[PDB]
Design a protein around this ligand. Sequence first.
Ligand SMILES: *[C@@H]1O[C@H](CO[C@@H]2O[C@@H](C)[C@@H](O)[C@@H](O)[C@@H]2O)[C@@H](O[C@@H]2O[C@H](CO)[C@@H](O[C@@H]3O[C@H](CO[C@H]4O[C@H](CO)[C@@H](O)[C@H](O[C@H]5O[C@H](CO)[C@@H](O)[C@H](O)[C@@H]5O)[C@@H]4O)[C@@H](O)[C@H](O[C@H]4O[C@H](CO)[C@@H](O)[C@H](O)[C@@H]4O)[C@@H]3O)[C@H](O)[C@H]2NC(C)=O)[C@H](O)[C@H]1NC(C)=O
Ligand SMILES: C[C@H](N[C@@H](CCc1ccccc1)C(=O)O)C(=O)N1[C@H](C(=O)O)C[C@H]2CCCC[C@@H]21
Ligand SMILES: *[C@@H]1O[C@H](CO)[C@@H](O)[C@H](O)[C@H]1NC(C)=O
Ligand SMILES: [Cl-]
Ligand SMILES: [Cl-]
Ligand SMILES: [Zn+2]
Length: 575
Amino acid sequence: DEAEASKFVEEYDRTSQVVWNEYAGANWNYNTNITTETSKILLQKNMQIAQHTLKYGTQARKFDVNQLQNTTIKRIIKKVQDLERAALPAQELEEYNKILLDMETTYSVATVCHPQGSCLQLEPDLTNVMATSRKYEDLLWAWEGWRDKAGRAILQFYPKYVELINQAARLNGYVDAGDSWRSMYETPSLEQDLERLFQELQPLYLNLHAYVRRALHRHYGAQHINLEGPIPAHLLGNMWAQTWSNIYDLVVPFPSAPSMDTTEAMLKQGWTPRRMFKEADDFFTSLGLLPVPPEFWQKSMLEKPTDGREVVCHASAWDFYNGKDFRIKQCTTVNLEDLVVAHHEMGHIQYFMQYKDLPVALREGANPGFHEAIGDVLALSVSTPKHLHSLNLLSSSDEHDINFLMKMALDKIAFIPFSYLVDQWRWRVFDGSITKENYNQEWWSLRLKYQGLCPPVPRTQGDFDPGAKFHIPSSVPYIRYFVSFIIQFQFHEALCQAAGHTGPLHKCDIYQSKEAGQRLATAMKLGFSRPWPEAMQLITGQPQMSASAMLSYFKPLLDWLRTENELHGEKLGWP
Ligand SMILES: *[C@@H]1O[C@H](CO[C@@H]2O[C@@H](C)[C@@H](O)[C@@H](O)[C@@H]2O)[C@@H](O[C@@H]2O[C@H](CO)[C@@H](O[C@@H]3O[C@H](CO[C@H]4O[C@H](CO)[C@@H](O)[C@H](O[C@H]5O[C@H](CO)[C@@H](O)[C@H](O)[C@@H]5O)[C@@H]4O)[C@@H](O)[C@H](O[C@H]4O[C@H](CO)[C@@H](O)[C@H](O)[C@@H]4O)[C@@H]3O)[C@H](O)[C@H]2NC(C)=O)[C@H](O)[C@H]1NC(C)=O
Ligand SMILES: C[C@H](N[C@@H](CCc1ccccc1)C(=O)O)C(=O)N1[C@H](C(=O)O)C[C@H]2CCCC[C@@H]21
Ligand SMILES: *[C@@H]1O[C@H](CO)[C@@H](O)[C@H](O)[C@H]1NC(C)=O
Ligand SMILES: [Cl-]
Ligand SMILES: [Cl-]
Ligand SMILES: [Zn+2]
């Protein structure tokens, strides 16, 4: 009966608002006031949402989705039959919940200490070391010590997590948890499509990699850099070598052309986290998109508090499932990286607002990549010389131009293979290809194959380097960021063209383009109501993911790199 399916999705939606609101409320109260009291309330709300998932999921499974006419009710009910972890029996779910809590807490309290002196946390202490030290050994101490204290301590938990997370997946009809995750894209050709895309970025990444490799050989010496080999994983300015912009100063194409201290200028000019978020809000409203509601300004946590309260710092954006209350929680630092991350979180928020009228089961991005790309699009524009000049964090030529593209490459191209490899790895863990006997070996095999990195210190039994990246102990899928990095350029190219921009794509700045706002709004309003190629068509006028836009943005940089690498006889890649 068509009418019994309408009634059920109606009830599911009313009761999910209540129960999902209560839980997000409590997970926030925890996340911005870690107590044991806020841990008790969080744990009680877990149960309550499991018990709601089970009730509604068991009812949804009694429907034959084959016999159901209405496509919206059909899609809603098929998602509700997926209970996730709530599929697990009582004991196993208790244990699943506790392992995730344990994993994340171990990552969060891990420090690295010097004998007789100070213990450094990841944020900001070790991050600063990796960003500003130019001494092999000091980079190594932080790189190895972070792996030693965070990675190794996670390993004890990881086999039981894989077993429970695959058990939930199988009870929802998937083969393993990697299957489940990939199913969010609704794209059977996903693994092929993804690989094609990564293969089109290889000329840019190999050329950038070779050139940076030569620059590290200049600074750190011939005995430490093989000009025909992988780069050591601790010399790229970042704990995971996922972005390389902190070594902009070793790799400047045109040192002759001086570029400003964005960070010194922000401090110098009395930039606060609040001003940083107000700039993002303004950019969105320049586009004709939506302003954050007053409530967001009052309830958000835009900076680390100083009232004693302890908090989880990792930047995240929060939907409270009532169409009114949205929040960012970020221990914002006053600089450029964090201004871009503020944009990224603000794009999460914009999406929440745009799709607040859909039923909650459709309150998600058209795919996870879409969710991650929105803010980055606005930020490509923010980061232009023309725009930074107008915030008065830059002054202002071809030299300046290649310099800008290099800065961008180090944040965008560099991240391409890293974002690809995380879930390459996890997918093989979940499918049983990789066992705990070779978690670590297979990590490094992929670090080599995709990124062209090696570990400065030979790894040993008990090492578990993936546990040293947040997203692994916290069980947050990562392929979304690879997708985002591709599609964000596609979105920029389209909005730029909507906005009437002529000439090279990288000089485009879309500030105040109502046309660009429109293209994005109508896609974001769709939520998860339709298969994603529809949202792509809306934005870009075609329905494929495509590296064309990215290659085109960096084309001047590719030309330069190729002439430069050729001039030095670089041998691209690494046997
Ligand atoms: C298959 O069924 C689809 C789903 O039907 C809906 O779901 C089931 C479970 C039952 O509840 C149904 O009775 C219900 O219709 C169906 O698709 C729907 O089609 C209608 C058009 O026929 C679309 O309606 C539009 O919705 C806009 C905004 O939606 C929300 O905001 C309203 C603002 O006042 C509000 O009243 C309401 O609020 C709450 O609802 C959701 C629950 O779904 C809840 O989660 C959330 O919290 C909301 O607050 C509403 O949902 C309207 O603004 C829009 O008006 C436009 O038209 C006006 C009149 O011409 C114009 O003046 C104006 O300019 C607008 O352009 C209109 O009412 C509905 O969005 C759509 N549902 C979805 C989610 O896709 C579909 O038709 C069926 N398929 C077939 C082939 O029959
Ligand atoms: C800061 C950002 N934080 C994530 C949110 C992570 C999270 C998910 C679920 C529960 C708790 C935390 C996000 O906003 O997607 C992040 O981790 N990253 C990822 C990372 O920093 O490794 C990759 C980044 C691409 C550019 C924007 C920031 C992306
Ligand atoms: C933090 O700790 C406890 C836990 O609920 C509570 O009594 C206190 O008011 C909380 N403070 C906040 C939210 O600032
Ligand atoms: Cl690593
Ligand atoms: Cl994903
Ligand atoms: Zn994000």
